[PDB]
Each structure stands twice: as C-alpha cells, then as structure tokens.
C-alpha cells in the first residue's frame, strides 16, 4: 500500500478499468458475497 497510485477514470473519482465491450461505454465491476463460516457451517438458515 505504501506508494501505490492509480488514476481515476469516471468523473466521481472511482477507479476502474473501462473495458472495450461494444465500446468503452461499460465498466466491469463484479459483486461477491460472504457469510460466517463456523456460525453458518453445520446449520443453514438460508445462510444469509
């Protein structure tokens, strides 16, 4: 982290590579989810 820079792309200072997909219009940002292991191991409770 000490000395690591990456230029902004959007107007609102959010870094992210603008991939060429039907053009440079779209940004590829994925979402990932996580829940408690132990606490939600044996059981299920829809593992919210």
């Amino acid at each position: 982290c000490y000395g690591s820079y990456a230029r902004p792309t959007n107007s609102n200072g959010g870094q992210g590579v603008m991939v060429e997909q039907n053009g440079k219009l779209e940004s590829q940002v994925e979402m990932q989810f996580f829940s408690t292991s132990t606490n939600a191991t044996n059981e299920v409770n829809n593992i919210q």
């Binding site: 408690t36 292991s37 132990t38 606490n39 191991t41 044996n42």
Partner: protein
C-alpha cells in the same frame, strides 16, 4: 471470550471453551474435527450444569458420570440395575425401539452400554 486481544494470540481449547464461557465459533475454530466438535458440544450442553467450576467441566469431559438424567454418560456399563442384559439399542430384538440409534445418534450409542 473476555480479554479481547485473545483472538491474536494462539489459543487453548481449555483457555477459551473451558475456563471461560465460549463461542461455539471459537469452539468450531479450535475443533474443526466436527465429530468431536459435536462431542464437545454435547459436552457443553450436558455440562450446562458443569460450566463451573473448572475441574467439574474437566470431569464432565471425562464423561464417566451421568449428568442429571444421564445424557452425557460415556462409560462401559451395559447392565440393567438388576443384572438383566441390555438389548442392542439399534437392533429390534426383542423390541423395536421407537427411540433408538436413528433418533439419538448424538449420544454415542455403543453395543449395549
């Protein structure tokens, strides 16, 4: 649970889930061997009256004595109070048990113990 900076030190199953009211998470974290985890859980549960003092929980871990109604007993005595042979819990001879190994697998149902 207490001594907040415990989660950075290495831990002791006996310095977390014995000498202290613990999370089954730290229990789960420290145990992983989920079979013995269930065993330790069964312990905790039965030892719900053996939470204190420490040596009481140690004995409840030994398991030679039945706690309360006898949910925790894990000895080798397989004889009735009057010397009658104990029937196999899982087997249907001579009675088909509605309450048997399938219904109570967590009690470690031995041969006829």
């Amino acid at each position: 649970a207490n001594t907040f900076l415990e989660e950075v030190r290495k831990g002791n199953l006996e310095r977390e889930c014995v000498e202290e009211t613990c999370s089954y998470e730290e229990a789960f974290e420290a145990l992983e061997s989920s079979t013995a985890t269930d065993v330790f859980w069964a312990k905790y549960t039965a030892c719900e009256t053996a939470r204190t003092p420490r040596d009481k929980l140690a004995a409840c871990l030994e398991g030679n004595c039945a706690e309360g109604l006898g949910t925790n007993y894990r000895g080798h005595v397989n004889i009735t109070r009057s010397g009658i042979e104990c029937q196999l819990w899982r087997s249907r001879y001579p009675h088909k048990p509605e309450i048997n190994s399938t219904t109570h697998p967590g009690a470690d149902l031995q041969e006829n113990f």
